[PDB]
Ligand binder design. Structure first.
Ligand SMILES: *[C@@H]1O[C@H](CO)[C@@H](O[C@@H]2O[C@H](CO)[C@@H](O)[C@H](O)[C@H]2NC(C)=O)[C@H](O)[C@H]1NC(C)=O
Ligand SMILES: *[C@@H]1O[C@H](CO)[C@@H](O[C@@H]2O[C@H](CO)[C@@H](O)[C@H](O)[C@H]2NC(C)=O)[C@H](O)[C@H]1NC(C)=O
Ligand SMILES: *[C@@H]1O[C@H](CO)[C@@H](O)[C@H](O)[C@H]1NC(C)=O
Ligand SMILES: *[C@@H]1O[C@H](CO)[C@@H](O)[C@H](O)[C@H]1NC(C)=O
Ligand SMILES: [Mg+2]
Lengths: 177, 184
């Protein structure tokens, strides 16, 4: 399974929440450093960039060697165009993805979009969005957390505005792994 | 083609501000503000103009009004400045009595205060300026070795802070410190 972390590097997150997010990335990643488990990372704001590709990923396996030059951008939050980046310029076999493997998508964002796009370009990918802010409250405004939802209201969107409020998602995130 | 106002602001912690994310488009597909601060939107009247209320701002924040216009998404940035009077300005305790002709040290420390490029500190034996220097670090270390001669016979030394927001319509925010009962 070629899983991907898509974290929110927009201004709207407290300068701390950025690092609390990473901790979570590691809560699943390094905890599940077991073989046959590939990952990636794309920080989205007003623009996009692949923090660490697969190529440099399975070279020095550890979430403290792949976040060497991370710089908190803190601009907007192009949530849609972010998902459409993991699709087109991320999961490309060229970088370092295995065909006979399931492409997962771990989106991390307060659930506040700065644009209205469409993810049909990758509607097949295993989505996994995790809230973290304060904005994720009323339905009148906050509803896009349902937009990238897949299966019925279960453990897709909960109170976890701090995904730290959850143990090791190894045997838990393996829903088809 | 975005825009926002006010472009600059100076305010105390917990204070609140209003911001108008405006825009000039035939028909914009989206308008919003980008901040870590608590947002609360205002009136419904209008279409290409939106007002909010950034509340409980403690750090110098900088909101960002965006807009997805057909032409494209643009951005208008405002700057929120927070200013505040320090926790304590008190100076370091020495005992009341002292031998004349002693190159003793007067140390004063201030903890907090912003904007820090406007906050100055001054040690002084009464209404006489002994040393005016800008608050450095946390707490702000400041020192001047005072002597004991003629103006020293039973004096009162003290430490004050002066935060000048006068260059921007506010007042001079200063705080005096507990006196130094020197005897001899
Ligand atoms: C309060 O802070 C500002 C910032 O240092 C002081 O000076 C100006 O600062 C801006 C950047 O914020 C610089 O670009 C300017 O060159 C500075 N102008 C000056 C000082 O000539 C401002 O003067 C400070 N107020 C006081 C008097 O303490
Ligand atoms: C430092 O000085 C400021 C003003 O220069 C003080 O602000 C006032 O503090 C008093 C309490 O002593 C309050 O009752 C006032 O309401 C404050 N001003 C306002 C908003 O009217 C500040 O308290 C001083 N700092 C300390 C440590 O007392
Ligand atoms: C006494 O004051 C003089 C004034 O410059 C200073 O040079 C000297 O170091 C002081 N004495 C101490 C604390 O060593
Ligand atoms: C000395 O300090 C006391 C204590 O606050 C103060 O009341 C007085 O005005 C000061 N002046 C002198 C030297 O008496
Ligand atoms: Mg954001």
């Amino acid at each position: 399974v070629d899983l991907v972390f898509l974290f929110d590097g927009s201004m709207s997150l407290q300068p701390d929440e950025f690092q609390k997010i990473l901790d979570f990335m590691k809560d699943v990643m390094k905890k599940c450093s077991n073989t046959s488990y590939q990952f990636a990372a794309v920080q989205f704001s007003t623009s996009y960039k692949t923090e660490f590709d697969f190529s440099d990923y399975v070279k020095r396996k550890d979430p403290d060697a792949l976040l060497k030059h991370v710089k908190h951008m803190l601009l907007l939050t192009n949530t849609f165009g972010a998902i459409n980046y993991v699709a087109t310029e991320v999961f490309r076999e060229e970088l370092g993805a295995r065909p006979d493997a399931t492409k997962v998508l771990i989106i991390i964002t307060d659930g506040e979009a700065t644009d209205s796009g469409n993810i049909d370009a990758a509607k097949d990918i295993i989505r996994y969005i995790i809230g973290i802010g304060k904005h994720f409250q009323t339905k009148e405004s906050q509803e896009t957390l349902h937009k990238f939802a897949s299966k019925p209201a279960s453990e897709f969107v909960k109170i976890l505005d701090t995904f730290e409020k959850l143990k090791d998602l190894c045997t838990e995130l393996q829903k088809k792994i | 083609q975005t825009s926002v106002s006010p472009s600059k602001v100076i305010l105390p912690r917990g204070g609140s501000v209003l911001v108008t994310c405006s825009t000039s488009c035939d028909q914009p597909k989206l308008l919003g503000i980008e901040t870590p601060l608590p947002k609360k939107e205002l009136l419904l009247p209008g279409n290409n103009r939106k007002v909010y209320e950034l509340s409980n701002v403690q750090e110098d924040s900088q909101p960002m009004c965006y807009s997805n216009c057909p032409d494209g998404q643009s951005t208008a940035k405002t700057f929120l400045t927070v200013y505040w009077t320090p926790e304590r300005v008190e100076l370091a305790p020495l005992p009341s009595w002292q031998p004349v002709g002693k190159n003793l040290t007067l140390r004063c420390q201030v903890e907090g205060g912003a904007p820090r490029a406007n906050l100055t500190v001054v040690l002084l034996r009464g209404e006489k300026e002994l040393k005016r220097e800008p608050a450095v670090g946390e707490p702000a270390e400041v020192t001047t070795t005072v002597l004991v001669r003629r103006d020293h016979h039973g004096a009162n030394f003290s430490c004050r802070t002066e935060l000048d927001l006068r260059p921007q319509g506010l007042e001079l925010f200063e705080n005096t410190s507990a006196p130094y009962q020197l005897q001899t």
